[PDB]
Amino acid sequence: NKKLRGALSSAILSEKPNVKWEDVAGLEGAKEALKEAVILPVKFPHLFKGNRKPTSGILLYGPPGTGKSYLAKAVATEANSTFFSVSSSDLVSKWMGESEKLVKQLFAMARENKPSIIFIDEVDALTGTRGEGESEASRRIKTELLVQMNGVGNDSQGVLVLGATNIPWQLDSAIRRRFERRIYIPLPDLAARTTMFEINVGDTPCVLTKEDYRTLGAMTEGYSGSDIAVVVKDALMQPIRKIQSATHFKDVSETRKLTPCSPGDDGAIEMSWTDIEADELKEPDLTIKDFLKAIKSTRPTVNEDDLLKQEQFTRDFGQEGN
Amino acid sequence: NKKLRGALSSAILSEKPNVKWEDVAGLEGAKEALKEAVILPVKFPHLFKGNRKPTSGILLYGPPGTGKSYLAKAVATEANSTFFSVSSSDLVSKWMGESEKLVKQLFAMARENKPSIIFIDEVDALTGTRGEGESEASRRIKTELLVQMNGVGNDSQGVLVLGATNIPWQLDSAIRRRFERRIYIPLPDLAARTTMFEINVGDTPCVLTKEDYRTLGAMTEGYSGSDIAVVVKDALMQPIRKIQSATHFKDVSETRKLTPCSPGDDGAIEMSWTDIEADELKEPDLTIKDFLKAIKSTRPTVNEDDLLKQEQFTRDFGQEGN
Amino acid sequence: RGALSSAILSEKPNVKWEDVAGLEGAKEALKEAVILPVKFPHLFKGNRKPTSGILLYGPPGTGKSYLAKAVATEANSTFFSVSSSDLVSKWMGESEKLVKQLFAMARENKPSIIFIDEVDALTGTRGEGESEASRRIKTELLVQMNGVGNDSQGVLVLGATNIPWQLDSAIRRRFERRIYIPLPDLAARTTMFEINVGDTPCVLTKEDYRTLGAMTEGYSGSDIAVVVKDALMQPIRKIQSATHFKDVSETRKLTPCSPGDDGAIEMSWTDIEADELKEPDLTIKDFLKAIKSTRPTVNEDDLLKQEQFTRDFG
Amino acid sequence: NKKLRGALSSAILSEKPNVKWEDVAGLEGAKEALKEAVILPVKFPHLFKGNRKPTSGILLYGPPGTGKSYLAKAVATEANSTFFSVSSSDLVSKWMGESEKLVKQLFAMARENKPSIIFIDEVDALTGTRGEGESEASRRIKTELLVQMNGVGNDSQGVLVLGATNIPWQLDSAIRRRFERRIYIPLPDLAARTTMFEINVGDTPCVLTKEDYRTLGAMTEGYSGSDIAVVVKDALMQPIRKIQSATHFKDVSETRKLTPCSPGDDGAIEMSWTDIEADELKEPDLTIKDFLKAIKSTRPTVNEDDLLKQEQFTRDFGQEGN
Amino acid sequence: EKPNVKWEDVAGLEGAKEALKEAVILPVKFPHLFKGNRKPTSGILLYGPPGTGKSYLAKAVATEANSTFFSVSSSDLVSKWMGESEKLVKQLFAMARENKPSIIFIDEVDALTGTRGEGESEASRRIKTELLVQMNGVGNDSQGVLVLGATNIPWQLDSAIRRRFERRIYIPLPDLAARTTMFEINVGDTPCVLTKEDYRTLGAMTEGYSGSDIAVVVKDALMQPIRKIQSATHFKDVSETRKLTPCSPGDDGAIEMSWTDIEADELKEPDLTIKDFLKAIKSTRPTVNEDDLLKQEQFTRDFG
Amino acid sequence: GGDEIVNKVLGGXXXXXXXX
Ligand SMILES: Nc1ncnc2c1ncn2[C@@H]1O[C@H](COP(=O)(O)OP(=O)(O)O)[C@@H](O)[C@H]1O
Ligand SMILES: Nc1ncnc2c1ncn2[C@@H]1O[C@H](COP(=O)(O)OP(=O)(O)O)[C@@H](O)[C@H]1O
Ligand SMILES: Nc1ncnc2c1ncn2[C@@H]1O[C@H](COP(=O)(O)OP(=O)(O)O)[C@@H](O)[C@H]1O
Ligand SMILES: Nc1ncnc2c1ncn2[C@@H]1O[C@H](COP(=O)(O)OP(=O)(O)O)[C@@H](O)[C@H]1O
Ligand SMILES: Nc1ncnc2c1ncn2[C@@H]1O[C@H](COP(=O)(O)OP(=O)(O)O)[C@@H](O)[C@H]1O
Ligand code: BEF
Ligand code: BEF
Ligand code: BEF
Ligand SMILES: [Mg+2]
Ligand SMILES: [Mg+2]
Ligand SMILES: [Mg+2]
Ligand SMILES: [Mg+2]
């Protein structure tokens, strides 16, 4: 009992990753559902009494790289609860009949520290429809999860089981019954892409305007959030490449801030950037040409049949999460 | 020898979940079989004398989320006897021989505290037809389960072995021989769905009538009991979204019982609901539109192939549970 | 040591030889093997040696443990009903010491008889199983089943197995007598219904028992027992359907009748005290309803695998 | 704890194999990307402050024998950081639930020694798109990798997951999303062939010139770097074959610098190389004939349809290394 | 593990013999040569039809190199546990680099893997990739350790494995002088009346056979005199203190008896002749197919 | 000896009882 608790004490994250609700762009239905099921019972507990009960499990599914773990980070930031983040390495053990007591002690600690939120990333690994998997450990861990979620002699009140998987049709039917709200996280639209561009650029000194952001959001068709993050990263990395290829420097304006230009200009001090010491550099401003170069350089990730399978699972057993 | 009983004493629940026979919507044959299994041998002991013996095992099976754990809770509430709620985490041990000594001590405690009820949820985890699974755990646990169920020198008289599983065809043939009552719990019909809506709505002030509940039960075609519970939960949470995403409140009829309405009325005061303190709260009552929106949002979970597998199992070795 | 005080039973469950319906060859083989070395001890000496190993197999729920209970009743001998729970320990070496002291106590308590239910729990065919708790226990049972010269007088090992093809070939060859327990035939079905009804009052005749046994096509003993249990429980359900009670004849013995009769006292059933409820009698319709309700618990794959096993090792 | 660290301590290499950036021919874009992503956060950490972050994973794919592991050796040489060289035999274990703990301990050991590089060679052997492979190994190892790369409560800052594969189209979509830069390593051109010849000739005495190397690089079109290395080794072993397969010898000119000759010359002494002692052997000089004989002797290994599949994957989700 | 087969005990295979001879003898005898860019061969593939002296040549290199040897097979590096059939290869290369320089002999490399096409994908990919990383890798620095691979089917290998193997040497069918030399080394020190022209006619007759076939027909021709000694009656006392020799039933003093009453060290064993070898070659049939030679021709044609 | 602890392995299960 105490050894399992000492092994599971490294699962409660005490880092609190600073991702707020305004950092996530789009996904209004998932935002509203997570907002009620996290904020409302711990802020206004007098409403949920009698016939009204909060949501006991939310499943987030979709294509890879859409913001499921980002929404989980936002929940862990704005939850003000003991956020439990487990995976398939904290529950599975080597001994016989010791992987089930781990899940039992995990849910016991979650009930002892209520209100608590359990986030199981990649639930598809633990639950495999119990058809032909490895019998003892697989079927026992599936039945132990099914017992500890609702069961008979448990009465899980106050806890929340968040799921985040990329392939949801490999989930067990009883586990899909336990996840009472299947929220589909789709590829973002134009306003969400423009908001992600404005968030990822942020406080960087740049000459980009609303029309430039609108043209970028219209240009990145079919892209995802990680693709937008890496094209913003490449567009931010490109001024350092211009500083690397910066023959014929030009000191413009305070305390000798050097700036590259065309070869041969006013004050064309032809040197390199190696001998220039720090705390005096001036990087060039960001234009739309660097972002167009990053868009032409970096390709999208997801294809157009996995989206068909996700839409098929949504129209079969899920709801639209905007 | 006493540490085994100290570990097994945590399987006897004492919380008594208040689920009565009127809470269960439908399943009259299963309720009558459970009544003649548990209520009769304690209330009328002068009938089961001689060659007349009570039932010594009942297997509840069906689609996921139909009410097997709910009938187990109702039996634990209205049984007035000792209720054993064990699983795969309370029988499998790390050592050698303890995995069978725990089952032997469990059945010894059940025979010492007669009349007692053993409820094993998800019996398919322990009984895996002993053809390909793990040799030690599978063979020893299954043979000890058979010996403790009937055996030769045990004489299990007065105990009841309840079992609830979603996969009845993956049971061992000897275990299926032991379970002398195969009761199929199906998806609820129209009258069961209407009574389940009447139970789950409760004493919430609504404008719904019996014809409205009948149209709701006719609308939910193929839903399960958990699906009815979550559409009731969504329709009950709908006035919270109505009082959240609306302005221009209006005092109706009482210390300012203000209610959201259309923008522009006799006193459409534009303010926020967060500034409104408690007990001056007049939320809008439930209608059929909120339940129609909950039906349109939430999708059924159970497919139409597992129903064919359960139908094949009924026509092979099963009764009907109405 | 003293932990083997639960392997022997002192209850002696009253199951006589007449209660076991059918199984005449297995019954007479067990009868001679448990009686004739005690009846005529001069008959077994030297060449004409008694049976030292009896194995029973077949479909699940056919009467193997029932025949073991009948042997323990009508044997007048020390019954060692032990399984794999009292043979394996947490330590090393004690799993062999348990079998050693078990056979020592069985030899000290001669004449005795050892019944191992579900012998396949000890024979995992040692593919990649647990070494110290499988292979050493199997070799210890093999060298303690070497009493063809040691235990000529004394112990006798039994065996009941639902799945006998997953058995170790060494102990299969050591078990010299392997009797196949089949599904019961029509005469065994009729006398099993007669035994399971017993002293309960009924209107069922020999033709009714014969057509019941003809209706039960492919049923087993436990299925016949639960059909008899359902037919016994049906008059309690008819009393529970309480409508228009009617007194018959001593000291107000009530009985429910059809709605609308002579003297139909419309009342409840729980308001009346005990020992004055004349219950209805067993017809054939409640038996037919129990037949339509209860399904056969055996399939065809187990039957063809049993046929393959008996045609391979008959 | 101690067992996992004692097993994973052997994955760290401290031998530092001396392969400089000049020892690799061509691959300018891959050289620039690896150069910035390994050099710039170590050399100038003040350039990446806040909004700008370095690359957190680079995939090096292409045909087999193109210099992927050689480029990884160059990074391990001039990285000046901790290098983790893991493979399939160091992560996959025999016990149940041991490989995931090994991956977690590997990333936890790499996070304690920031900055660190993890070179998972042959990622195709550990990623099999989670479609039909082995359930336990596939799902649990890939799930632990996907959680341990970025996750929620990990914060992988200062690590780099270098991956080198030959069949990148058989990788998971989530893993392709994890690897940010998928750099194509194509077949070398004429300039890279001449540069490989100029760095593979070394400092051995030869009469080959710049136009000789240009004609050789024109003749070895359709080959790869391993083929250029083996024809260089074969042309280097051809004078030793001329040493061994010769009977008539000749002593020309300092302290018996003896060489083979034709049968019949000035001092055609017939002896053996076993009779030839040390510090008196002179090898024949190199020419274009030995290199042409080696080129005609060894056949290429790369086919012509997997190049089309690599070009298809490059046009789909790939960069250009050049 | 040390055999006793020198260079002269192998008949034929001149190119493979000289290639292995230089590649395993030139560094260990002349250390003043391999300096700078001169590196020895770090892989040799010996393919061809089965039974053509591949393991015999491997034992010859194991003898004449005077270095440590490792003669594992395909079944030794295949386990049933998950992830245990690669730690064996890692420990193999670790104990090879512990006793450098060393020679590693791996038999049936086509049967070690399954070219990751249709078989077990997890085990096949992990075995193949761990073999490749242990062959070159990054921090594995294999210098002095020679990987000597032999196989019977070379066209079912991987492109990366055939890239890792530097010299793909083909072992062809034996020739006339190779067959006569194999007969001369297989007949041994038995008393024989055979001549060089008899060996030449025998080798002209057995064209298309293999080395194992030549070995078993020599064993048959050596066992046929002691077979005809036992399976005969009506012996004959020829000439010196009861020298008995079998003959036809009915001759000049055909003594009908068995071999039990014949005294020891006086039974005249008949010398083996040409007709025993003719009976052996007329009984024994060739084993190889015809399309495998076309596959070897194609494999040499694009990987010569 | 001491106690005997049951462990679990992987195939492609069993009980490799690694005691203390
Ligand atoms: N919907 C989104 N809103 C805001 N940022 C997003 C969104 N989707 C992706 N991103 C950005 O891209 C990154 C990728 O999202 P992440 O949480 O890693 O997704 P995943 O659940 O696939 O692991 C985020 O950390 C964030 O920086
Ligand atoms: N037949 C039913 N009658 C009443 N409530 C039901 C019924 N089926 C489901 N429910 C409701 O939905 C929940 C899910 O049923 P539950 O007992 O958990 O089923 P299971 O045995 O599949 O786990 C119940 O706890 C109850 O709140
Ligand atoms: N020959 C029989 N005579 C009477 N009842 C029988 C017979 N065979 C089976 N039964 C019934 O079926 C049950 C099966 O026998 P039991 O000893 O409980 O188990 P098993 O046959 O599986 O060892 C008996 O207890 C009895 O109720
Ligand atoms: N561009 C190059 N420059 C120098 N050497 C190269 C180059 N490309 C390939 N090689 C040589 O080819 C061999 C193959 O290298 P490696 O990256 O291990 O191939 P792979 O990883 O595809 O098996 C190396 O030994 C290396 O010396
Ligand atoms: N070319 C050869 N020279 C000498 N002996 C040979 C030759 N070919 C076959 N043999 C003999 O045949 C026997 C069987 O050969 P074997 O080693 O099984 O072939 P492989 O190595 O192809 O498996 C060996 O003992 C060997 O002595
Ligand atoms: F959708 Be992410 F890759 F979890
Ligand atoms: F999900 Be339930 F137990 F059918
Ligand atoms: F055939 Be029984 F279940 F022993
Ligand atoms: Mg995620
Ligand atoms: Mg249930
Ligand atoms: Mg039995
Ligand atoms: Mg490589």
Side-chain angles (χ1 to χ4, degrees), chain C residues 192-211:
Chain C
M192 195 179 291
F193 276 117
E194 174 56 61
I195 283 167
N196 281 133
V197 169
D199 56 87
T200 304
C202 81
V203 307
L204 286 300
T205 66
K206 197 215 293 183
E207 190 63 42
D208 295 320
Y209 287 141
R210 186 187 177 182
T211 191

Side-chain angles (χ1 to χ4, degrees), chain A residues 221-292:
Chain A
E221 190 190 4
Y223 281 69
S224 43
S226 75
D227 303 330
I228 289 177
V230 300
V231 300
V232 166
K233 185 197 304 298
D234 182 87
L236 285 166
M237 201 49 184
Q238 208 156 4
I240 300 174
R241 309 167 193 173
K242 281 192 175 183
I243 283 295
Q244 280 187 357
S245 199
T247 177
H248 290 272
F249 280 103
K250 175 175 63 181
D251 186 25
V252 189
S253 171
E254 289 286 331
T255 174
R256 201 159 169 85
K257 273 163 72 67
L258 294 102
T259 305
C261 52
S262 182
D265 279 324
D266 180 23
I269 310 176
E270 183 176 5
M271 61 154 53
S272 159
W273 73 284
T274 302
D275 45 355
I276 308 179
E277 77 280 342
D279 315 298
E280 69 161 357
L281 266 300
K282 179 182 175 308
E283 313 176 30
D285 52 329
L286 297 176
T287 175
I288 209 178
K289 193 166 167 289
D290 293 331
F291 281 78
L292 189 60

